[PDB]
Write a protein that binds this ligand. Structure first.
Ligand SMILES: [Cl-]
Length: 251
């Protein structure tokens, strides 16, 4: 689906994931002591943690299994938690392939099932990349099963420019629209935020097309985007970012 070349920026993140899974997977011999299977991606939501996990899977040519912590939470649903790991081990043996269980919203597993999960982790020493928008909520005992913890931050200028270039590639822009200006004006927003902003501008012009019974939409202008930015605000708070920075600092 995707790989490191498709990902713009995030140097440090790529490096970390090279240390945690990619290198150890290509050359297990250079890691004789045995090396973590727990990986924790954390940061503000709509920042591409899933994309990152899938890319990692792609680079080591792994099996990818996505899991939502809110699906298995709904008790006897406890057994399925082991269902997944089982399937993973078995498939791994089967195809001569590493396996990756990706869990979104890991903090959701936090009363009985959580215990089995942690077991299944301990049975690891197949990788588990968990992802959380709320890492605090994770208690120390849980956080001990993930030794490698990676902070995926808000998109920077280069990335936001990449996102605008992607999302607008297929729609008509005014010849005066600078993708660079959009990137600057979007400091603080998320990847999802950018997607939604572009979708908004597009809808706006489509609504006009239908209303004025034109068979075509007018070019999206810079003012359209500015109006939208006046109304819509970062879906993540400046203080939440700090809350990430002090937790990462916390360890
Ligand atoms: Cl994210």
């Amino acid at each position: 689906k995707v790989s490191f070349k498709d990902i713009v920026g995030l140097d440090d993140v790529k490096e970390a994931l090279r240390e945690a899974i990619i290198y150890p997977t290509k050359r297990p011999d250079l890691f004789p002591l045995g090396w973590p299977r727990g990986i924790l991606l954390y940061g503000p939501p709509g920042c591409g943690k899933t994309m990152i996990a899938a890319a990692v899977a792609n680079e080591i040519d792994s099996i990818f299994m996505q899991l939502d912590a809110a699906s298995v939470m709904s008790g006897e649903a406890e057994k399925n938690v082991a269902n997944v790991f089982k399937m993973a081990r078995e498939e791994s043996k089967k195809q001569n392939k590493p396996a990756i269980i990706f869990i979104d919203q890991l903090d959701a597993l936090l009363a009985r099932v959580r215990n089995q999960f942690l077991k299944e982790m301990d049975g690891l020493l197949v990788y588990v990349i968990g992802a959380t928008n709320k890492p605090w909520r994770l208690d120390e005992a849980f956080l001990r099963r993930f030794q490698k913890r990676i902070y995926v931050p808000l998109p920077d200028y280069e990335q936001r420019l990449s996102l605008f270039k992607y999302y607008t590639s297929k729609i008509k822009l005014d010849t005066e629209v600078s993708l660079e200006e959009l990137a600057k004006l979007t400091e603080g927003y998320t990847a999802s935020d950018i997607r939604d902003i572009v979708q908004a501008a597009h809808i706006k012009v489509v609504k006009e097309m239908f209303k004025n019974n034109l068979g075509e939409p007018r070019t999206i202008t810079l003012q359209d985007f500015k109006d939208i930015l006046k109304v819509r605000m970062p879906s993540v708070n400046p203080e939440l970012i700090k809350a990430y920075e002090a937790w990462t600092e916390k360890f």
